[PDB]
C-alpha cells in the first residue's frame, strides 16, 4: 500500500475491541484480520493505525451486530512516529467502517483522524472533521 508517511507500532491485535468512530450504527468493533498480513508461528496478528482490518460488529443496532465488515484503523493509543521524530497518540483506538471500494459506510466521522490515514483512504479523509 501507498506509504503511510509515518512509523507506527500496531496498538491492536486480532480479537481486540475498538470503537467504530462514525454513524453506521456500529459502536464496538472486533479486529478479526489485517488486510495483507502474514505473521509468524505463535503471534497475535497485529493491527495498527492506517490498516485495512477485517472487523466484527460487537455492539450496535440489531441490524448491524454480527456483521463481518471492512474498516480502516483511524485512531489508536500506541504512539506513531512522524518524520521529525515527534510521537502522536490518541485518546482511544478507533476505526471507520469502509466498503468494497474503500469509501465510508456512514456519513459522519466522530472524533479526530490521522493526517496519514488521509493519504491512503482520501475518501475517508474528504469526510474527516478534525485531521491531526
Amino acid at each position: 500500500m501507498e506509504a503511510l508517511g509515518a512509523d507506527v507500532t500496531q496498538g491492536l491485535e486480532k480479537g481486540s475491541l475498538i470503537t467504530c468512530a462514525d454513524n453506521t450504527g456500529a459502536r464496538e468493533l472486533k479486529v478479526i484480520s489485517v488486510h495483507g498480513y502474514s505473521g509468524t508461528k505463535n503471534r497475535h496478528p497485529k493491527a495498527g493505525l492506517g490498516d485495512k482490518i477485517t472487523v466484527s460488529v460487537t455492539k450496535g443496532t440489531p441490524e448491524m451486530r454480527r456483521q463481518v465488515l471492512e474498516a480502516v484503523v483511524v485512531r489508536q493509543r500506541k504512539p506513531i512516529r512522524r518524520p521529525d521524530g515527534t510521537r502522536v497518540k490518541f485518546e482511544d483506538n478507533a476505526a471507520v467502517i469502509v466498503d468494497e471500494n474503500e469509501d465510508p459506510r456512514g456519513t459522519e466521522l466522530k472524533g479526530p483522524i490521522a493526517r496519514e490515514v488521509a493519504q491512503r483512504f482520501g475518501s475517508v479523509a474528504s469526510a474527516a472533521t478534525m485531521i491531526v
Partner: protein
C-alpha cells in the same frame, strides 16, 4: 502438524566466540575503478545525537523537506600510513612480498611496535617493481595506524595498527600513489578518502556481553504457560532427537555473546567535519567532549564508545550517492535527560 518457524538466530556469524583482534580487519576491499587511492580509514566511536537534513532522495515526495535523523559521532583524527606492503601472486593465493617504510614516525608508535632503525626503502621498492615487471605483483596495501593520543576521550595512547588496501589506478600508478603518501609522514584525514553523502562500510567489534543464555543469545522463546513454573524458564526444549545420537552444533546453546567482529554495511556518512559542532551538553556519556576531526555516521555503529571503528567505501552500495546533504540542525541537547 506443528506450524513452521525459521530457526532461532543466524548461522552465518559462527562460531560465536570472542574476537581475536579488537581492531577490525576487512576481508573484502572495493574494486579498482577511479584514481589511485587508499580504500578505507578509521576512527573512534564517541556517541549518538540526531541531526536535521533536507531530503536528498529525488524519488521521495519529502525531497526538499526537513527531516530528523539519528547519528553516531565518531572522532576520526588523522592517521599515518607508515608503510607500503606488496603482494606477489603465488599458487597459494596472495603472500606478502615486501614492505616499504619511513623515517618520520609518531612519537609513541613504539608503544605497540618495534619501530625500524635501519630500513632500505629504495631497495625494497626495487623488489616490488621487478615483481611488477615480471607480472607477479598482486595488490598494494598500506600498513596504517591511528593516533589514539590525539583523542582525549580515549585513554589509550598505544596506537591501533591496521593494514588497508590501495586501488583505483593501474598497478603502476597506484603503487606510486602509495609511496608518495608514505614517503612523507603518512598523515591523511577522512576527507582524504571520503565526502559527506557517501555510503561506507563500518566494521567493529560488538559490545561486550559475556556469557549469555539461548534466549538472549539466539533469540529463543522462554518457557510459556505452565511450563515456566516447573523449574525451567530460559532453557530450550531439548538438544536434539533420539538419533542422531549427538548434539548438532546448530542448536541454540549458552555461550559467549558479544565482542564479535561485525561489518555493518551501507552506512551513509551524513557529515564529515572538525570542531565541537557535534558535542553534547555535559559531554558524551561515558566518553567525553568532542572537539576536532570527526564524522557523523547515519544510524548505529557496531561497538561501544571508545572502540576503534573502521570505514571503507561501500563494497555493495544500493543507491546512488548524494554528496554533501544539507545539514540544517545538529543536536547539542544534553544526553542526560
Amino acid at each position: 502438524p506443528q506450524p513452521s518457524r525459521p530457526r532461532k538466530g543466524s548461522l552465518g556469524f559462527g562460531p560465536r566466540k570472542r574476537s581475536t583482534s579488537e581492531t577490525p580487519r576487512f576481508n573484502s576491499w572495493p574494486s579498482d575503478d577511479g584514481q589511485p587511492g587508499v580504500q578505507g580509514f578509521a576512527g573512534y566511536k564517541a556517541g549518538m545525537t540526531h541531526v536535521v537534513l533536507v531530503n536528498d532522495e529525488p524519488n521521495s515526495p519529502r525531497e526538499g523537506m526537513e527531516e530528523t535523523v539519528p547519528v553516531t559521532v565518531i572522532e576520526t583524527p588523522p592517521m599515518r600510513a607508515v608503510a607500503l606492503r606488496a603482494y606477489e601472486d603465488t599458487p597459494y593465493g596472495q603472500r606478502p612480498l615486501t614492505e616499504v617504510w619511513t623515517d618520520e614516525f609518531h612519537s609513541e608508535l613504539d608503544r605497540t611496535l618495534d619501530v625500524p632503525e635501519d630500513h632500505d626503502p629504495d631497495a625494497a621498492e626495487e623488489q616490488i617493481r621487478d615483481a611488477h615487471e615480471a607480472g607477479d605483483l598482486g595488490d598494494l596495501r598500506l600498513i596504517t595506524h591511528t593516533v589514539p593520543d590525539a583523542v582525549p576521550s580515549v585513554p589509550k595512547k598505544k596506537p591501533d595498527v591496521m593494514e588497508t588496501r590501495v586501488g583505483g589506478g593501474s598497478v603502476s600508478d597506484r603503487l606510486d600513489h602509495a609511496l608518495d603518501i608514505v614517503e612523507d609522514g603518512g598523515e591523511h584525514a577522512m576527507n582524504d578518502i571520503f565526502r559527506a553523502g557517501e555510503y561506507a562500510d563500518v566494521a567493529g567489534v560488538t559490545k561486550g556481553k559475556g556469557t549469555q543464555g539461548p534466549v538472549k543469545r539466539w533469540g529463543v522463546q522462554k518457557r510459556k504457560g505452565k511450563h515456566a513454573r516447573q523449574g525451567w524458564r530460559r532453557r530450550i526444549g531439548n538438544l536434539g532427537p533420539w538419533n542422531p545420537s549427538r548434539v548438532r552444533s546448530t542448536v541454540p546453546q549458552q555461550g559467549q555473546t558479544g565482542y564479535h567482529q561485525r561489518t555493518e554495511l551501507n552506512k551513509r556518512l551524513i557529515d564529515i567535519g572538525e570542531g565541537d559542532e557535534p558535542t553534547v551538553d555535559g559531554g558524551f556519556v561515558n566518553y567525553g567532549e568532542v572537539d576536532g576531526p570527526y564524522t557523523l555516521v547515519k544510524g548505529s555503529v557496531p561497538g561501544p564508545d571508545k572502540r576503534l571503528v573502521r570505514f571503507r567505501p561501500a563494497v555493495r552500495p544500493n543507491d546512488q550517492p548524494r554528496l554533501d546533504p544539507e545539514v540544517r540542525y545538529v543536536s547539542n541537547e544534553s544526553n542526560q535527560g
